[PDB]
Structure formats: C-alpha cells, structure tokens
Design an enzyme around this catalytic site. Structure first.
Site, PDB file in Angstrom:
ATOM      1  N   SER A 203     -22.635  18.930 -21.901  1.00 59.68           N
ATOM      2  CA  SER A 203     -22.141  19.215 -20.558  1.00 59.68           C
ATOM      3  C   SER A 203     -20.813  18.516 -20.302  1.00 59.68           C
ATOM      4  CB  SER A 203     -23.170  18.800 -19.507  1.00 59.68           C
ATOM      5  OG  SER A 203     -22.578  18.714 -18.223  1.00 59.68           O
TER       6      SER A 203
ATOM      7  N   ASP B 229     -25.490  31.313 -17.767  1.00 54.23           N
ATOM      8  CA  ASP B 229     -24.850  30.138 -17.194  1.00 54.23           C
ATOM      9  C   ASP B 229     -23.891  30.576 -16.096  1.00 54.23           C
ATOM     10  OD1 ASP B 229     -23.589  27.678 -16.641  1.00 54.23           O
ATOM     11  OD2 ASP B 229     -23.726  27.045 -18.732  1.00 54.23           O
TER      12      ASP B 229
HETATM   13  C1  LIG Z   1     -27.064  20.001 -10.355  1.00 51.28           C
HETATM   14  C2  LIG Z   1     -27.388  20.351 -11.585  1.00 51.28           C
HETATM   15  C3  LIG Z   1     -27.130  19.556 -12.849  1.00 51.28           C
HETATM   16  C4  LIG Z   1     -27.897  20.332 -13.932  1.00 51.28           C
HETATM   17  C5  LIG Z   1     -27.721  21.782 -13.460  1.00 51.28           C
HETATM   18  C6  LIG Z   1     -28.096  21.652 -11.965  1.00 51.28           C
HETATM   19  O1  LIG Z   1     -27.654  22.743 -11.163  1.00 51.28           O
HETATM   20  C7  LIG Z   1     -29.620  21.491 -11.845  1.00 51.28           C
HETATM   21  C8  LIG Z   1     -30.254  21.010 -13.153  1.00 51.28           C
HETATM   22  C9  LIG Z   1     -29.406  19.940 -13.830  1.00 51.28           C
HETATM   23  C10 LIG Z   1     -29.790  19.512 -15.281  1.00 51.28           C
HETATM   24  C11 LIG Z   1     -30.993  18.609 -15.401  1.00 51.28           C
HETATM   25  C12 LIG Z   1     -31.040  17.771 -16.425  1.00 51.28           C
HETATM   26  C13 LIG Z   1     -29.956  17.672 -17.456  1.00 51.28           C
HETATM   27  O2  LIG Z   1     -29.345  16.404 -17.362  1.00 51.28           O
HETATM   28  C14 LIG Z   1     -28.909  18.768 -17.246  1.00 51.28           C
HETATM   29  C15 LIG Z   1     -27.759  18.615 -18.256  1.00 51.28           C
HETATM   30  C16 LIG Z   1     -29.528  20.143 -17.430  1.00 51.28           C
HETATM   31  O3  LIG Z   1     -29.615  20.811 -18.421  1.00 51.28           O
HETATM   32  O4  LIG Z   1     -29.979  20.597 -16.236  1.00 51.28           O
HETATM   33  C17 LIG Z   1     -28.482  18.847 -15.769  1.00 51.28           C
HETATM   34  C18 LIG Z   1     -27.495  19.970 -15.394  1.00 51.28           C
HETATM   35  C19 LIG Z   1     -26.025  19.575 -15.512  1.00 51.28           C
HETATM   36  O5  LIG Z   1     -25.781  18.400 -15.713  1.00 51.28           O
HETATM   37  O6  LIG Z   1     -25.200  20.463 -15.411  1.00 51.28           O
END
Ligand SMILES: C=C1C[C@]23C[C@@]1(O)CC[C@H]2[C@@]12C=C[C@H](O)[C@@](C)(C(=O)O1)[C@H]2[C@@H]3C(=O)O
Lengths: 109, 95, 334, 438
Positions: C182, C280
């Site tokens: 990310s 995405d």
């Molecule tokens: C506000 C956020 C942040 C997400 C997307 C989301 O919309 C909701 C879920 C988050 C998340 C949760 C855990 C992980 O750190 C992450 C990278 C993921 O895959 O999904 C996290 C992911 C991200 O870091 O982009």
C-alpha cells in the site's frame, strides 16, 4: 498608572492563561491580584467543555491542595505545550489532580 | 462633561448579530476618541456603575496587554528577591 | 451486498472491522485519535526461539528519531540448540543471499512493524522466498506528515547495506530487494529513486497495491465508490493528512508522473513487479503507474488480477495469494 | 474453537459466530451512516473500550451505545561488548562446571575488559562480575533507595495510576470501602485515589486503609507515621478515614482473622500488591497460602504489578542469560537520562537486584521473577478470573509517559486484558486485575 483592586480584577480578567501569568510578574498590585485564584479558576475551567462534577466541590478541593495557579503551571502546561488545539476532558483533569494530591502529600512531612 | 457626553453618545446608541460588527467599528472610533480619557473613563463608569460599557472598555485594554514584554507593558501606560521569585515561579511562560 | 460474494467471510470480517474502526478514529477537522488507535491495535513481540523455521529480533537503528526495525532470519539448520545473542548477527552461508527490505501499509497513518498482520506476512516471505527480511517502523501522519517516512526508509537502507554479516560470498556485496505494501509500496518507489541517485544498487522492486492518486476523478473512482471497503472521502482525508500544507493531490509524492515530478528517462531504476488489484477504487492510478513505467524506458512486470480486492495477501485462503507469492519467489531467486 | 487464520492476526472469533459478527458489522455500518459525525464523536471520547480482541463483545458494546518466548533488542555497541559477553558467559559456565580455578582468572578477566568498555555495558559488567566474584567465595538508605526510584524511573508511577483506575472503577456504587495494601511502603499510591473519590459523582464513601510492611524497629512506627499524614489529608478533602498498621516478616505469616474485616456487603474490599509476590517464591508453599487468604477476604478487585521476565529457572546459566538481557535493557533506557543523584542511587537499587539474582540461593534469593503467562497460571488455579483494563487506563499511562519522560522511548500496549510498560518493543512490567470467578 494606578488602578483599584476591583479595577485590576476587571482589566486582568480578559487575558486568558499565558498573558495573565505574564501579568503576574509586572506590578506588585497586579502581582497580588494575579495570585487571586478566581482568574485561574476561570482559566482552567475554559480548558474543559464538561468536567463532569459540580464546581462547588471542585473549587474547595483544588484550593485545599495548592490552588489553581499551581495546577495550571505544574501539570496543565506540559499537557498543552506541544499542541494547544486539543481540549482537556475527564482523563486530563483526573491525571493532573492526582499528581497535585500526591505532591501535596509529599510536602506533608 | 466630555465623559458625560461620551456616555450619552454611547448609551443612546445602545438604545438606538449583524449590528455588533459595525457597533464595534463605532466602538473603535469611540476608544480612539475615548483614548487618554479611557483610564478616567473607568473611574467615570465606577461613578455611574455601567455594565456593558465597562466590559467593552476593559476589553480594549486587555487587547492591548496581549503580547508585550515586561518593560513593554511598563512603557505602554508609564507604569531583587521578588523579581527573581516571580521570574522563577512563572518560568514556563518565559520558557 | 456486493463485497460479500468476492471475498471469503473471514477476509470480509477483517476488512470491515478495520474500516469501521478507522471511521471511528477519523475526526473531520484533520486530527487523529492516536491513543484509541494504539489501544485497538493488535501487536506481537520478537522471539529468538525458531517457530516454523523463522526467528526474529529487534534492532534499534536510530535513537534520535527512535527508528527501529525487525529482522527475520531462517533457523540455523547446522546447529541444534536455539541461537544465542551472539548468534543473531552471524554471517550467512551461501553463494547468493537476497535480503528484502519491507515497508508496511496503512495509508501513512495506521499499523506498525509490530502488528500481527505484517509480522505474519514477513514470516511467510522468509518461509517461501528463502531469504531474510528487515521490516522498518517508520513515523506516521498527521503527527509526522512529510517527508518523515521517506527519510526513515533511506536510513534503514543505509543501515542494511552496511551489515558485514549480510554480505554474499559470490561478490562480497549485499543484494537488496525493496518491497512495499500500500503506502509502503509508495515509499518503496521513492526510496528506490533515492537509491538510484546514490551508490546503492537495488536490484529489484515489488509493489503490492501501491498508493498513488491525483486531482482528477478516474472512472474506477466514480464507478467503484464504497462498493468494496474503500470510499473517496477517506482517501481524500488520508491524502490531506499526509501531504504538506497548501498542496493539492498533484504533488509528486501523490502522483509520480505529475508535471512537477521528475522524468524516468535516462535514469537507472530496478526492475519492477507491480501487483494491481481489480476491484480496487484506485485501480486506474496503479495501471497508469505501470504504463508510465513501460513508456519511460524501464522494465516492469504487471500483474493485473481481475477479481482481487484490497488485503488479499493477508490470508492464505485464496488463489491470488498463492499466485502472487509464487511470482515473488520467482522474481527474487532469478 | 477460534478461527486459526484470524487468531494468528490477533483476533479471537469463534468459527460458529462468524456470520453473527458479520451481521453485527452490517448493522453497525448502517447506524454510522444515520447517526453521522456527532454520534461517531460519542463513540470516540465518551466510550471506554475493553478487550479489542473479542470482536463479539466490542461490537455489542458499540451497538448498545449507538442505540518460552525470548524478546531481545540489540542497541548499537562495539565488539568489546561481545568480548565482555563472551567473558561473562565464560565465567558463568566455569563457575557452574565446579572449575573454581578458571573462574578466578575469568572474573579478573572481566574486570580488565570493563575499564576499556564504555557505555551502559560497563555498568552491567561491573555489577555482574561483583555478584560473580562473591558467588565463587560462597562455594569456596533503603527507604531513600526506593524513593530515588520514583522521580527517575517510570515503573512506580505507572504501577500506581494504572492500578488506581481499576480500583476506582470497581468502587462505583458503594458507600463503604476498604483497601489492603500488601506493598504499603510509604503510601504514595493512595493520595491520588482519595482525591478521586472526593470528586466522585454521588458522594464520597467512607475510606478505610490497612497497610502491611516488613519488620523493622522503625517500620512498625513508620507505618503508624504514614497513616498520620494520610489522616490529615482525608480531612482537607472531607473524607472519612480509618487506619491500622501491620508488621510481618512475610505475607505467608498472615491470616484473614486478624485483618478485622466487616461483612463484605457493608464494606467493599480491594486488595493491592505491587512488586511483592515475586519475593514470596523463595519460600516453599508461600504463594499458595497467600492466594488462599485473598480468596478468604472475598474482595472485588486484586491488582498485581510485576516484572515481565523469566528469572526463576532451575538452571543457573539459564537464569544468568535472561537476567543479563533484561538488565541490559534497563541500563540502556537510563543511558540518556540526565545525570543526577537520583539516577546514581537508581543503579545501586538495581545493582542490589542483580547481586541477589545470581549470588544467592534458597530463601536468600528473592528476585524470583515470572512472566504473565506463568503468573496467569498461578492465579487461574486459585480461582481469580481476569478483570480487563479499559482505554481510560491506557490513556492516562500514555500521558504519564509525556509529562516526566519526553524523548525516552517508552510505550504502552494492551494484551489479554492487561497493560504493559516497555522500552520500544521490549516489555518490562505488566499490570493485571483479577476477580473471583463465579
Ligand atoms: C480505510 C481503509 C484502509 C484499508 C482500506 C480501507 O478503506 C478499509 C480497510 C483497510 C485495510 C485493513 C487492513 C490493512 O492494513 C489494509 C492494508 C487492507 O488491506 O485493508 C488497510 C487498507 C489500506 O491501508 O488501504
């Protein structure tokens, strides 16, 4: 020039925290009127949107342990020094008053 | 008198939201004219026991006091154990 | 209703829980609830006892900024007893040994190297790719907005390149692969740029859903908005928190191919492996990044998975995870 | 049974509850869409969160309100440290091999290396060689010292404030209270608790205090002296007070009959113990007798603060290895602290801890530290169910680490309903609260 006690209590009212403590070091009459703990009572009360307890019990307890001036100087100013945006709540009051009570107990002997 | 006419031209205006901003502009012109006589305008207010004018006129002095150094605060209105004691007791303001 | 049929139930629960918690922790006036975020974060600690062939230990790289990293190594097969303190920084035996320098995700604001989701990922990387990993604990926003992470990465890389016990017997050098997830992938790209400018020779680059954006609204943002765990509102919140004051989303830290950015022509860059998720919200930006790499005169292997959401790599219960891990292993041992 | 793929990630969710949890999440989402920002603010600042790992309970709370492990950290050092550790590990094995001839040279060898060495490792080597020196010959102030540990190290203040919140939360709704301090010491925990009951909503209760202390010609009256000052404080804030001191060689010399306890419904009882239970493991059978008395008291809470390490192994060089790592972290945390007489007397306080750790044996060795996993096994067999700590306690500990400690890297973490204070990623101490299982 020269101002009366109630006159200083009015002019030194609208100066908030830093500038009041600034004015605690200028004039002997303003020194005495700044040692007055009602200005600091208002200053500390501004930091909280809801203390959660009545003012009647809070004022006596805080003045019995050293006063509002020492409460602000010793503990509140560290908590507000990095960032002044955040407003203190329940936990900050509890922490600072617990530290004040412990400090009062240290001087007790 | 001058302070008497001043309190008339303030209090009939008081009698005469969006009004407070231009009221405060008129108050700026006021304490500009009320300058010098301002400190004795406090004594006139005590003579008269005013409430709104007292707060408004104390607000201007308070707005001055903000952000001046010790001797600055001295020279605005012409005003060593205790000195060091107050300096050390209020060090956080100077720190 | 639309995200339930594209991911397993456990993945849905994990991502939804993260989303609602981060919703609670975000304040409209641009401030973050740090104490509650740290209270709700699940963490682990380093263990020198080899578990499943992997053991870890923490190293305090910097003390002025409190910069820390966790090192993951395979268990010493030659010896029988568990390693001692001196055995931790033992020279590696092997003609070629790759070390992966990993940066974790969280949109520059969440998670840490001690988190129970990135520790598991680093252990799995060690187990599958047969390497050693260094996971960095960089500073976070909005308390440390910019460029704090890009400096933590540079310091960690300078540390990794100096370990005499990480050198390879083939050429007396350290073979470093920058990897990021990310926002970490974002950092990885930028760190690689800096590594290009100096004498450090990074050999590869791995990006898993890198975090890039822009002023304009791409078709994926309009069509996919709140459908799979991500909304444009929180994306803009995080970009506002990370970026400096008075700058828009065309800042080079947001979009690498902005007019104010830097050109990748006549520039030495590592070979890139970019994994782009299909479902995405910001898929178009990632595809544009891959296309810009291809058209800039550089090497890149794009991996576009059609039905992949965010966080597919946090659980080994889908085919996308296995395919990506196999591709990473082939990319590393080449 | 939990979900294996999620339990690795730090979440305890039943495999048969999955759907339910998901449904709750859906519901939560809808509410956060309706109630909007203001409601979410209520969820952040007006809520206390308990045990984030249990997703079912956390989601239920939100819905109801809207309606052997070896942790090691390597700090920057020199190879002379490795030569020191090699010399230190050489003497510990030589003294364990009944050599007693190479040990004298090896102990002398450590001394010549320490002078060249600079940093915190010189202090740890000096205190371990001295304890290794007079172990060889064994087979062949105090009040001010615990004072100096208060204004320099943050472990005592963390232990007091974090335990006070658990006691304060359990005292709500009661009119008469009674707390028993197994670690009365000089009574620095209690002044902060008394002011919290004075400002308590609904009215302060009648506060009764009973302390227990180690024997001494002066500590019998020092405990009387402590209550003299606490009695004067309870009158300045208008709190009804009562006191009674104790003298006892060990906590195993206690019984419930001589504590003078009223019925528990009339007066609520809360037992406290900070850094005291590890001094009881040297005596055989000591810990099982004391934990059978706490059950006899029938309190509402029992807060324990200990040290997170395994310094009670049955093998000497095992104890030597772990203790060297743990006391290396402690002396690394104090490296950046400004030099002061409080700092100097803090190392002597810890030096006496190292020296008792390896030189002594049998009941003479009192530093029998254990880990929360081992400690939780002892309490669980007694019948003490955990009482989870909330985010209010977590918050104060974090601001506590910001008033007195500024640049030093101390962190707070939550684990299994407990709180830990550590340096960076290395845990040092842990605070836990327990209640009788029903
Ligand atoms: C506000 C956020 C942040 C997400 C997307 C989301 O919309 C909701 C879920 C988050 C998340 C949760 C855990 C992980 O750190 C992450 C990278 C993921 O895959 O999904 C996290 C992911 C991200 O870091 O982009």
């Amino acid at each position: 020039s020269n101002l009366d006690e109630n006159l200083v209590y009015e002019v030194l009212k609208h100066v908030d925290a830093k500038t009041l403590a600034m004015s605690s070091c200028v004039s002997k009459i303003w020194h005495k009127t700044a040692q007055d703990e009602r200005l600091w009572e208002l200053i500390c009360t501004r930091h909280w949107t809801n203390i959660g307890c009545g003012q009647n019990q809070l004022r006596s307890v805080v003045l019995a342990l050293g006063g509002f001036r020492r409460l602000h100087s010793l503990y509140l100013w560290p908590l507000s020094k990095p960032n002044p945006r955040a407003r203190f709540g329940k936990d900050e009051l509890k922490l600072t008053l617990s530290l004040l009570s412990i400090r009062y107990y240290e001087k007790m002997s | 008198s001058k302070i008497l006419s001043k309190v008339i031209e303030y209090c009939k205006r008081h009698v005469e939201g969006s009004s407070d901003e231009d009221l405060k502009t008129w108050d700026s012109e006021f304490i500009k004219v009320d300058q010098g006589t301002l400190f004795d305008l406090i004594l006139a207010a005590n003579y008269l026991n005013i409430k709104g004018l007292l707060d408004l006129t104390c607000q201007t002095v308070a707005d001055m006091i903000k952000g001046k150094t010790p001797e600055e605060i001295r020279k605005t209105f012409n005003i060593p154990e205790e000195e060091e004691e107050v300096r050390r007791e209020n060090q956080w303001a100077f720190e | 209703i639309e995200s339930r049929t594209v991911v397993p139930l456990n993945t849905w629960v994990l991502i939804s829980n993260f989303k609602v918690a981060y919703n609670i922790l975000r304040r409209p006036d641009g401030t973050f609830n740090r104490h509650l975020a740290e209270y709700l974060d699940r963490k682990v600690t380093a263990n020198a006892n080899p578990v499943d062939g992997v053991f870890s230990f923490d190293v305090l790289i910097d003390r002025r900024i409190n910069l820390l990293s966790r090192v993951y190594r395979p268990a010493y097969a030659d010896q029988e007893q568990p390693p001692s303190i001196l055995d931790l920084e033992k020279p590696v035996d092997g003609d070629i040994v790759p070390v992966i320098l990993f940066f974790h995700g969280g949109s520059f604001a969440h998670s840490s190297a001690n988190s129970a989701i990135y520790d598991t990922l680093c252990r799995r990387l060690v187990g599958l790719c047969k390497c050693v990993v260094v996971s960095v604990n960089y500073r976070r926003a909005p308390e440390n907005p910019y460029p704090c992470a890009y400096d933590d990465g540079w310091i960690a890389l300078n540390w990794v390149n100096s370990r005499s016990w990480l050198k390879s017997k083939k050429d007396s050098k350290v073979h470093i692969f920058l990897a990021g997830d990310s926002s970490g992938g974002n950092i990885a790209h930028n760190v690689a740029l800096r590594a290009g400018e100096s004498g450090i020779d990074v050999l590869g680059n791995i990006l898993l859903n890198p975090m890039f954006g822009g002023n304009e609204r791409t078709e994926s943002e309009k069509s996919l908005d709140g459908k799979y765990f991500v909304t444009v509102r929180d994306r803009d919140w995080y970009w506002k928190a990370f970026l400096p004051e008075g700058e828009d989303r065309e800042h080079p830290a947001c979009n690498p191919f902005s007019p104010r950015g830097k050109s990748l022509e006549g520039v030495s860059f590592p070979k890139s492996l970019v994994v782009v998720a299909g479902l995405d919200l910001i898929r178009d930006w990632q595809l544009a990044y891959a296309e810009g790499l291809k058209k800039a005169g550089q090497e890149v292997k794009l991996m576009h998975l059609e039905k992949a959401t965010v966080g597919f790599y946090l659980l080994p219960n889908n085919n996308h995870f296995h395919n990506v891990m196999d591709e990473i292993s082939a990319f590393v041992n080449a | 049974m939990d979900d294996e793929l999620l339990a690795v990630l730090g979440y305890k969710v039943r495999s048969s509850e999955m759907a339910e949890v998901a449904l709750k999440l859906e519901q939560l989402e809808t509410m956060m869409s309706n109630v909007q920002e203001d409601g979410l603010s209520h969820l952040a600042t007006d809520t206390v969160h308990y045990n984030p790992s249990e997703l079912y309970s956390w989601l239920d709370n939100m819905l109801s309100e809207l309606n052997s492990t070896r942790s090691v950290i390597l700090v920057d050092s020199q190879e002379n440290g490795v030569r020191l550790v090699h010399a230190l590990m050489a003497c510990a094995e030589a003294i364990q091999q009944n050599n007693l001839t190479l040990a004298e040279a090896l102990v002398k060898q450590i001394g010549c290396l320490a002078v060249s060495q600079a940093g915190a490792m010189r202090k740890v080597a000096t205190y371990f060689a001295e304890a290794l020196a007079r172990r060889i010959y064994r087979l062949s102030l105090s009040d001010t010292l615990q004072m100096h540990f208060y204004e320099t190290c943050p472990y005592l203040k963390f232990a007091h404030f974090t335990a006070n919140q658990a006691i304060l939360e359990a005292f709500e709704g009661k009119k008469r209270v009674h707390v028993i301090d197994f670690s009365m010491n000089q009574g620095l925990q209690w002044p902060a608790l008394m002011q919290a009951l004075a400002l308590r909503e609904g009215g302060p209760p009648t506060f009764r205090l009973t302390g227990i202390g180690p024997p001494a010609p002066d500590n019998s009256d020092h405990l009387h002296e402590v209550g003299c000052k606490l009695a004067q404080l309870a009158e300045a804030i208008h709190v009804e007070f009562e006191y009674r001191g104790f003298v006892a060689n060990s906590l195993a010399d206690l019984d419930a009959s001589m504590l003078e306890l009223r019925p528990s419904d009339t007066e609520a009882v809360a037992v406290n113990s900070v850094f005291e239970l590890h001094k009881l493991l040297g005596r055989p059978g000591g810990i099982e007798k004391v934990l059978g008395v706490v059950k006899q008291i029938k309190p509402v809470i029992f807060t324990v603060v200990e040290q997170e390490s395994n310094h009670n192994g049955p093998v000497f060089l095992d104890r030597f290895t772990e203790s060297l790592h743990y006391y290396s972290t402690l002396f690394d945390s104090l490296e950046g602290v400004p030099n002061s007489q409080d700092k100097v007397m803090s190392e002597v306080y810890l030096g006496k801890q190292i020296c008792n750790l390896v030189a002594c044996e049998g009941p003479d060795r009192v530093e029998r530290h254990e880990t929360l996993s081992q400690w939780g096994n002892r309490f669980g067999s007694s019948g003490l169910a955990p009482a989870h700590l909330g985010s209010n306690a977590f918050k104060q500990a974090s601001m506590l680490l910001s008033v007195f400690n500024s640049g030093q890297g101390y962190r707070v973490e939550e684990s299994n309903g407990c709180l830990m204070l550590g340096w960076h990623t290395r845990p040092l101490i842990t605070t836990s609260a327990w209640k009788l299982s029903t």
